[PDB]
Chains A and B, each alone.
Chain A
Amino acid sequence: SPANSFHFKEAWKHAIQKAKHMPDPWA
């Protein structure tokens, strides 16, 4: 799941999803 379209929105999505737990599955 890249971040190129808006970049910020996708990264702010993905990196922040992952931050939810230490062993966090964003999938």
Chain B
Amino acid sequence: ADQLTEEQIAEFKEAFSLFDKDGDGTITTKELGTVMRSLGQNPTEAELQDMINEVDADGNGTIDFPEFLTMMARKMKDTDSEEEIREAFRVFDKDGNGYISAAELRHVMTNLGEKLTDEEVDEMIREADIDGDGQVNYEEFVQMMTAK
């Protein structure tokens, strides 16, 4: 579950360096909390440390690029099981509609700082909404989540 393609790795190089403010090759909670700060979120030291330590396999206490590759590849596809897919569904449809609603996804985006327009989220939902209910159910989202 650590597979990335070369172009994929190249993008992660970029992303990694965007968070790695010191440009040293390891991301600290300082850097995370700062990118979060500019994003409009102030998580705790504990949240960020745990977040790191989860991917921190070498035990140095920071997120190295190999570990990031591991982390992302699991988030983008599988940790092992369908956890990642349902956790993503869970963060989109909190209200339990059984389907992800665009209006709610727009709301979570505002909360995530991604800041997407209604038309943007509408299009995202529309493609994921396979049966055409205007809302995407889990079975529809499972195909979409891995389509990155």
A contact set with B: CB distance below 8 Å: 1, 8-9, 11-27
Q: How many A-B residue pairs have CB under 8 A?
A: 75
B87/A8 in contact, CB under 8 A: no
With A1-B15, A23-B43, A27-B27 known as contacts, the answer to whether A13 contacts B32 (CB < 8 A) is: no
Q: Shortest distance in angstroms between A22's beta carbon and chain B's nearest beta carbon?
A: 7
Query: Please, how many angstroms separate the alpha-carbon atoms of A13 and B27 in the complex?
Result: 21
Which residues of chain A come closer than 8 Å to B63, judged between CB atoms?
Answer: 25
User: Interface size bucket, B side?
Assistant: 35 or more
The contact string, 1 if C-beta is below 8 Å from chain A, for chain B 1-37, is 0000000000110111011100000010000100010
**Chief secondary structure at chain B's binding surface:** helix
Query: Please, how many angstroms separate the alpha-carbon atoms of A6 and B66 in the complex?
Result: 27
Q: Shortest distance in angstroms between A24's beta carbon and chain B's nearest beta carbon?
A: 8
Which residues of chain A come closer than 8 Å to B68, judged between CB atoms?
Answer: 27
Query: Please, how many angstroms separate the alpha-carbon atoms of A9 and B148 in the complex?
Result: 6
B88/A26 in contact, CB under 8 A: no
Q: Shortest distance in angstroms between A8's beta carbon and chain B's nearest beta carbon?
A: 7
Which residues of chain B come closer than 8 Å to A13, judged between CB atoms?
Answer: 76, 148
Partner of A20, one of B16, B41, B84, B123: B84
The contact string, 1 if C-beta is below 8 Å from chain A, for chain B 62-88, is 010000100110011000000010011
B11/A1 in contact, CB under 8 A: yes
Which residues of chain A come closer than 8 Å to B43, judged between CB atoms?
Answer: 22-23
With A8-B123, A20-B84, A25-B19 known as contacts, the answer to whether A1 contacts B91 (CB < 8 A) is: no
